[PDB]
């Protein structure tokens, strides 16, 4: 209700960039190795966005070292330091789960030149 | 468990329910008062009142939407030419249900559902 909405608004980030399903984004996240906290970048196509307030999330799919990896980031998590849109993609669906069956030239996404 | 769920199956499949409520909505618009069962009337409210709210604003798009919801141009015309203008100021609740005894054939609880202004 108003109570939970207040408790969530006080935790929501205020700078989350606008990204649509199909865009290529780089998410820099905090990884901690023992005693040193550094930033690691995950760049790939946003194949799903779940808009749910503080519980908002987005899935990014990359092909790393010959293997497909998907990472579901909690948008307002303190571990996601930054999100940047490196390329705007032109899709028509909201969930590009069909890319999971496509590889190489078959998985290309046209740029939204607008 | 049906926790926090809406709608009545009414011992029908979904297509049958949709067709029945389309026909019954047309009948209520046409006659302005009909006698049905109490469950069916309490669902006809949720079918019909949104149509009148749609008719409140007259556009080609809204007329086509109303045709899709109620495939009959006489009902669309009445909604957009009389009923909408009539219920313009009313917020909601364009219908009322009056319980009217039990059906002789099956002891079914019966009711009259009518447009409020009628």
């Amino acid at each position: 209700s108003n109570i939970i909405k207040q408790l969530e608004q006080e935790q929501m980030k205020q700078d989350v960039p606008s990204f649509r399903p199909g865009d290529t984004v780089e998410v820099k996240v905090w990884v901690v190795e023992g005693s040193k906290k550094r930033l690691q970048a995950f760049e790939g196509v946003v194949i799903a966005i779940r808009n749910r307030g503080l519980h908002s999330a987005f899935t990014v799919r990359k092909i790393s070292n010959g293997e497909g990896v998907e990472r579901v980031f909690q948008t307002h998590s303190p571990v996601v330091d930054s999100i940047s849109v490196k390329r705007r993609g032109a899709v028509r669906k909201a969930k590009l789960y069909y890319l999971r069956e496509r590889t190489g030239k078959a998985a290309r996404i046209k740029e939204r030149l607008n | 468990m049906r926790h926090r769920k809406s709608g009545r199956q009414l011992n029908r499949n979904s297509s049958h329910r949709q067709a029945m409520f389309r026909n019954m909505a047309g009948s209520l618009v046409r006659h302005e008062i009909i006698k049905t069962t109490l469950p069916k009337a309490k669902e006809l409210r949720r079918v019909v009142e949104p149509l009148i709210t749609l008719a409140k604003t007259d556009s080609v798009a809204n007329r086509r939407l109303a045709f899709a919801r109620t495939r009959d141009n006489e009902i669309v015309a009445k909604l957009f030419n009389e009923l909408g203008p009539r219920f313009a100021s009313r917020a909601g609740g364009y219908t009322r249900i009056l319980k009217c005894g039990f059906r002789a054939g099956d002891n079914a609880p019966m009711a009259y559902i009518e447009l409020v202004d009628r």
Binding site: - | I33, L98, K99, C100, G101, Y112, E114
Partner: protein, 56 residues
């Protein structure tokens, strides 16, 4: 599955102890016509809460 012994008239009546019907507690009287009716239902003449609702 079926009875091994015939149940009695006593047991029959005991089972039917909960089968009795319940009379209507009271009938409401319309403020305008004075006709009696089931509460929250229209009268036979078509009056509910003092207003004729169905013409006949």
């Amino acid at each position: 599955a079926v009875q091994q012994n015939k149940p009695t008239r006593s047991k029959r009546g005991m089972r039917r102890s909960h089968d009795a019907l319940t009379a209507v507690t009271s009938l409401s009287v319309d403020k305008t016509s004075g006709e009696k009716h089931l509460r929250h239902h229209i009268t036979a003449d078509g009056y509910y809460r003092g207003r004729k609702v169905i013409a006949k």
